[PDB]
Amino acid sequence: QTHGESTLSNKKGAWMDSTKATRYLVKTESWILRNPGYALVAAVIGWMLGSNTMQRVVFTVLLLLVAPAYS
Amino acid sequence: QTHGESTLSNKKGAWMDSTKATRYLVKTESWILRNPGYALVAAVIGWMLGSNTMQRVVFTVLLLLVAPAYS
Amino acid sequence: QTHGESTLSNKKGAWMDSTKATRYLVKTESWILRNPGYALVAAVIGWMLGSNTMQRVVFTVLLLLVAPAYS
Amino acid sequence: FNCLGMSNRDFLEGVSGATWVDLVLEGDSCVTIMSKDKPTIDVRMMNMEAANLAEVRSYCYLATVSELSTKAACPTMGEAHNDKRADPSFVCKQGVVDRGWGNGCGLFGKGSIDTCAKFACSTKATGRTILKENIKYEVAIFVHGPTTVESHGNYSTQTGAAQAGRFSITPAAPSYTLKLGEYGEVTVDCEPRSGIDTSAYYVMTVGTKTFLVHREWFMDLNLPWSSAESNVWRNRETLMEFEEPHATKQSVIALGSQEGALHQALAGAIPVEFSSNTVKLTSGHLKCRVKMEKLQLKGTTYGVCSKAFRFLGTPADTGHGTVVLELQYTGTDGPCKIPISSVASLNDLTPVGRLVTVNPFVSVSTANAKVLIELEPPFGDSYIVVGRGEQQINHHWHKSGSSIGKAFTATLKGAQRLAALGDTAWDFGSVGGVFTSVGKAVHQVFGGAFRSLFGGMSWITQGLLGALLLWMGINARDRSIAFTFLAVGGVLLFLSVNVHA
Amino acid sequence: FNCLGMSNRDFLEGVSGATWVDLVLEGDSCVTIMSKDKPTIDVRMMNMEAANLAEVRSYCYLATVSELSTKAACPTMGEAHNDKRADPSFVCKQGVVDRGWGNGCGLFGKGSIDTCAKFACSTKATGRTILKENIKYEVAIFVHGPTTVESHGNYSTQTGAAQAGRFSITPAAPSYTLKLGEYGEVTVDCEPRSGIDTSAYYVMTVGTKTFLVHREWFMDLNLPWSSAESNVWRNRETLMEFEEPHATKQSVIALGSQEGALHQALAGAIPVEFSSNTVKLTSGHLKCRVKMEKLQLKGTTYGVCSKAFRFLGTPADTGHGTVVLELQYTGTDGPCKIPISSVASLNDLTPVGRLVTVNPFVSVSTANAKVLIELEPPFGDSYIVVGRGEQQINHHWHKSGSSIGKAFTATLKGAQRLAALGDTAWDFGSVGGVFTSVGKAVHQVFGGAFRSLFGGMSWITQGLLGALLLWMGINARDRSIAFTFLAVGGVLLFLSVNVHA
Amino acid sequence: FNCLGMSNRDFLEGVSGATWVDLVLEGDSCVTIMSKDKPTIDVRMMNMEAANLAEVRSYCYLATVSELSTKAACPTMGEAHNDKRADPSFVCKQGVVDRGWGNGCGLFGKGSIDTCAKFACSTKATGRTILKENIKYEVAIFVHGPTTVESHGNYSTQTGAAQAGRFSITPAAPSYTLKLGEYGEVTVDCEPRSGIDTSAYYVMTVGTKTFLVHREWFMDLNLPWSSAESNVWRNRETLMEFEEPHATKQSVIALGSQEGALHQALAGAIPVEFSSNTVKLTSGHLKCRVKMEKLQLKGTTYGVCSKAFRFLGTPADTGHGTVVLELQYTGTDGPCKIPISSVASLNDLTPVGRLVTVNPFVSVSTANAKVLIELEPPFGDSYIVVGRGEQQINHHWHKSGSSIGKAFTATLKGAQRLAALGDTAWDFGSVGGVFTSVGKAVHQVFGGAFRSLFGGMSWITQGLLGALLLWMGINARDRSIAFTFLAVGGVLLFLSVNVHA
Numbered sequence A, B, C: 001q002t003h004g005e006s007t008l009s010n011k012k013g014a015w016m017d018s019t020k021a022t023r024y025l026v027k028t029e030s031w032i033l034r035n036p037g038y039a040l041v042a043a044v045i046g047w048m049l050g051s052n053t054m055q056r057v058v059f060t061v062l063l064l065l066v067a068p069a070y071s
Numbered sequence D, E, F: 001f002n003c004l005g006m007s008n009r010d011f012l013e014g015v016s017g018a019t020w021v022d023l024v025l026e027g028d029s030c031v032t033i034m035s036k037d038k039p040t041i042d043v044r045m046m047n048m049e050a051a052n053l054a055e056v057r058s059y060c061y062l063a064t065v066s067e068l069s070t071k072a073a074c075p076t077m078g079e080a081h082n083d084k085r086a087d088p089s090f091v092c093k094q095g096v097v098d099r100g101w102g103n104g105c106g107l108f109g110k111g112s113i114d115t116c117a118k119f120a121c122s123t124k125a126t127g128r129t130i131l132k133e134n135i136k137y138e139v140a141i142f143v144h145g146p147t148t149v150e151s152h153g154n155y156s157t158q159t160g161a162a163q164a165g166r167f168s169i170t171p172a173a174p175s176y177t178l179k180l181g182e183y184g185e186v187t188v189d190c191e192p193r194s195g196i197d198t199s200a201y202y203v204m205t206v207g208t209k210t211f212l213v214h215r216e217w218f219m220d221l222n223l224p225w226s227s228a229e230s231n232v233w234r235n236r237e238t239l240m241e242f243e244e245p246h247a248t249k250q251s252v253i254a255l256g257s258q259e260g261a262l263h264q265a266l267a268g269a270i271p272v273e274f275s276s277n278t279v280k281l282t283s284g285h286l287k288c289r290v291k292m293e294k295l296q297l298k299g300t301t302y303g304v305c306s307k308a309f310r311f312l313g314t315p316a317d318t319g320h321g322t323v324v325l326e327l328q329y330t331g332t333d334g335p336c337k338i339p340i341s342s343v344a345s346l347n348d349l350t351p352v353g354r355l356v357t358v359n360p361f362v363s364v365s366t367a368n369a370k371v372l373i374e375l376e377p378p379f380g381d382s383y384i385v386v387g388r389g390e391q392q393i394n395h396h397w398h399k400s401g402s403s404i405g406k407a408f409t410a411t412l413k414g415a416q417r418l419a420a421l422g423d424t425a426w427d428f429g430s431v432g433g434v435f436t437s438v439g440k441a442v443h444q445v446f447g448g449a450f451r452s453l454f455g456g457m458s459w460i461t462q463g464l465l466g467a468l469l470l471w472m473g474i475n476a477r478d479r480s481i482a483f484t485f486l487a488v489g490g491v492l493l494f495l496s497v498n499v500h501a
């Protein structure tokens, strides 16, 4: 588990601020690029699970986010 | 990321077989036990976002899995 | 945890055959005699919980058996 | 080796043409087999001996505690860790104690302490497993020939007269052909590997008394247990009590001997004899097939003696419908068959009762020879006539009961045997047949589910559940579920009652 | 090389006139072929070995940073360019720092700095590719003949008896013909080129431990990497940390060794032995066809053994339904055929269980000869009889289990093999077959679609998605979409459970 | 100390009716206080030097495995236990291995293997606690008086002139009255104990660099750890890998160094300086109360300089809306006040801008004296005029921006301060009033629940939750529910953006 943002009200940089944006997104983008066929599965399941457009898109996003980071 | 199960049809153990069950759930359980206040948030959002009981429970599970693993 | 009847098809007696009848009843008898006031609670709860003359009796028996053997 | 004087005894009347019959040979029981012409034999297993027991797990019920040490830590500084955290003979427990400036600390709070004690057991209860390669049953076969009242139970005289034999039945030699002097050969092939389910029991030795315990019960004991090869102990926290968290020193005491608690927990365990790493139990069963092709009568070519007999004592009912009497032959006419029969009246002298001692005769040629004869008189009044003419001796005998009561008792004993042996009981007295095979198959099918559903339940729970199921079936609406509810409730009630508890 | 003692073992029955059979030799998993009038053979691949590995990419996990240098610029003078941009092996990062009259600048604002550091990582995790023309599967073939317990697993003695042989299967020579002494010849025509997809895996060496890793996973690592035989490193900034910006000097420190992080990242990798640029794999599968036209049974013309045998020790169940026992022949007549059979009853004496050691026979003519014989007894009580008459010896044996349970176990093993091997599983134990070919084609299509859809999921993701798909299929109104949802969910759930985690 | 040329700088205004100002001193941030008829001061905290750190837990990130030993057990028997398992500092793991007649066993099955190895840690990552009785802040106060460009940052010359001073703020001495020569005295009443939440942080020293890590994160590391002065380690299985269960010898290899994994996991940790058991961190905050009642203005008795000045360079914008310039006085009039002002036009001469250096004057009595002066001109075109008459010098200055832009920037900076400090931000620059107290109470009430609910989320998940909550609030029915969803979503989005990730 990564440390995450501290609560010390720091104005300088932390240990790794260069990767602060890509710290969590590296695994998901790499997993999606390696296995792009899942994007169809997540979209279809989200479309068939939600009765509203908001529910369908939220389902699609959650499925696209949970598969790379398995839990 | 982690390598994951090989496709070579191995009959012996992999490099780390003892941690196979706890490899992906180690972060989730630790995060949930660290701050259980989110479990209320996930339940409330899933209840207020889904129209059927199946939709509500799927939303709750997806949120409870997507918050610990931030992506 | 006691041993219980063995499946060896013995025609003689087991280790403690004299207590074979009172082993699972001494504790219940001693508990019931110690505080007979609970017997009213079990009967009332069974009567108010069962909607049939058989359900009330079964509930009362189960409640009168669970309390002496807290397990 | 003989059924005479045993409360557990069953008779098997062999049908004509069949040369073998299946047996189960329950422990401390006895099976008496009589054919249309062949001599009557009784066969039983005296014991089941298994040697070279292998240790599996050794529990400990008496332990000692010494070398106390407590290491205290200040509050909010994490749990303390004593220096004696090493595995060998040291077990530690964490605890919280009040700390402050009075105790020499710097903060007030629930400081954490770690105290360790030296664990050393004094007496242990070793458990041993039975290797199926070393089990050997002891089966005894006896033939009802010329015997007295004193020599009937004396094995030395019976084996010297070639009328009995004790032999060992092993998996490597499951078939034995017992040699008899003039009665021929009797062959019995058994099933040692499936007789006693030794793969479901352990040989637990508590102090000086040894038991045969279930494997599941033995592994569920919450006591300090070591491995086979006298290694370090595990689960030692059960035999120790940490008195009260104290910053300076927390005393640790050892619980009293759990030998009495073990004996209390060994309720249904079967005590067995243990010596020289060898176990011996007289319980259990052993399915056998006795073959009587070469079994023959002795002394059939003898002529009936013309001298007179006298009743030594009174005939005694054995409790199984047969009566045993002893006759003293007053003549010196050598070996000769006894003209003894059971009749309903003395105006016809037609034999109505069957003789257990088939073709009795006098063996020795002495002046007075004592002969023990066992008969099965008919129900009601009957006579035991020996000879004819002016030297005929009669003995009135009354046999209480009836054939209907005999049928009820046979049904009850069969049900008890089925409950005690399960599917093995269907191979008792079976010469084959398709009814026996399908009955055993359906009994296995039903009994697997029955055990899986009501395995560990005691007789009280079995009885209560059977009563509940009967009540549900009586009030049930659909007849399909009512039948099965009544059946299962009746089986459970019978099982609860059958323990006589 | 032998099939005895293996946890994984498959039995295949060859039909009458079956000249060949297609096998899939799995790593550390023997398969025994049983056919009528032919000796039973067990063939297994021992290891896949590839030499002359070609290096592709080499990540490095332990880096060294030295020669720190930074160039500062005033807030108006634009960005700062250090003179080490033209020098390779130097990693430079542009930063922003506060500049003012206190720092020696002219104006006030956010200045620009460019800090460079020399990157030279010493320990690298080199990955290598496998050349399809250098692999060589090692396959061993054995025949169940006259063997002892002490010499059954001795490869030297079996080669001396011409009963076993280790041979190397290469893409150049996929076919090998093993010449047995009097058992004939066995020919294996394998497919080494397609047995293991070398293009799908890399040989990665991290520290002293070598792994077989996915090609896609290896190329996705975020570490400084250099191509084969080159010192040009890329992505060097991943192992370098730039501290707080400073006008005079910004400190750059390399991160700690990532060897442990790599080991944690290699959780699913398959460890392999790597030495002298040669990799050896004990896992994998090799599709092969075994031809037994020239395989002839030995000892068919030998006479039967007149003298008696004896059981040296207890027979042992191998766990696959077969029983292995050792027999000592008391006679010394010479090479004779052992009359051993498995019978349900000692009186019936009819063959009910087959023999794995087809046509057993004593080979040597010495006084006492030890012979290892493997039999497959029927479920339930049975007897292992050797010889007839007075010399007959019996050994009772009980085989726990049922045919229905065996059927369920076989179905589970088939499903596991299908999951592990995919389309190759249909080739296992197939003699031609129209059903086999169409099944393999349909499974190829379905497996391609299934991999394209859910290839990269772990067992947790597969299990959760399978449960969700099952729930959707249950509530789906249309039968067809419900059926496909249920099928996909069941397959995903089985795959998640199949990993036993 | 001085903050000429710092990215973070706050300008407080002294209320006419308030004698003290309550301000929060943040790390690497300045607060400038300007009052009427009082000298300008800037208060800044340098760092926090906590000493006598107490070690709590020491994880191990590099282990060594040696003295390999193993012991195997026959199947269907007691599980194996190595003799080294009793020996301390040995890690053992159970497993199953294939055992048969080949391996010297007696039964075919899955025997139990037990291997143990020696555990020795090479380098360990030590964690320490900060005792609240040892925290010590370094706060420095500077008064804007006669300074040059080179001497504006030297602490020696500023103390020689009694214009600045660094002092230690400790819980036992929370107040310090800084005496200033001819400028009066300024006393600060800080809150050291409640300044930093030092009970929620550990001082982790991995390798040679030290960090300030959370307590909830430090205790979740899955590495071999030991207590203070504890040689015995716990949770050692994480750094040991048991390769393959082998009956003869199972190989155990320690994983690689976890220093890189630790550095990768310390992503948001704050690096600190640790030396001689003392931690020094320049970040954090400290709430203090400055008393300016006795702070008097120096140079109000001097006369105006009569000779001519000169600008030593082009005035520089500081980035905070102020202008810093240095003058040189060619006269020898001794201590004299500089007639510098900021006028909107050269024909008006009425001062429109405010001087940060209140009442500037020349300190030394010699000629060619350099004086640094800071002004706050208005937005638009303005002139910096020094002197009057024939010796007047003017410099045109343009201040970009507008009043509304400054208002928006101040609102954004206040929101960022509220996000970074929480309820402490309400006590910044507030002399009292009911609004500040009720605002702080409401903020505490809301933030407690906010941190309970959205406590340990990163920026990406916070942004996603904010977007989802905004979307649900837009499509909401109840006005109150929509209002609260909009508020929470906006707060989450602002927090995610404020990380600038």
Ligand SMILES: *[C@@H]1O[C@H](CO)[C@@H](O)[C@H](O)[C@H]1NC(C)=O
Pocket (backbone or CB within 6 Å): D154, D156, D157
């Ligand atoms: C059996 O008879 C012999 C005759 O010598 C006698 O010694 C022995 O004691 C008898 N057995 C028993 C158990 O009385």
Ligand SMILES: *[C@@H]1O[C@H](CO)[C@@H](O)[C@H](O)[C@H]1NC(C)=O
Pocket (backbone or CB within 6 Å): E154, E155, E156, E157
């Ligand atoms: C095989 O047998 C030979 C000859 O008896 C002996 O030298 C050798 O050590 C044996 N090999 C094994 C692995 O037992």
Ligand SMILES: *[C@@H]1O[C@H](CO)[C@@H](O)[C@H](O)[C@H]1NC(C)=O
Pocket (backbone or CB within 6 Å): F153, F154, F155, F156, F157
């Ligand atoms: C500040 O000025 C004094 C006096 O000249 C000198 O001794 C000191 O070294 C200077 N310090 C710095 C940091 O310039």
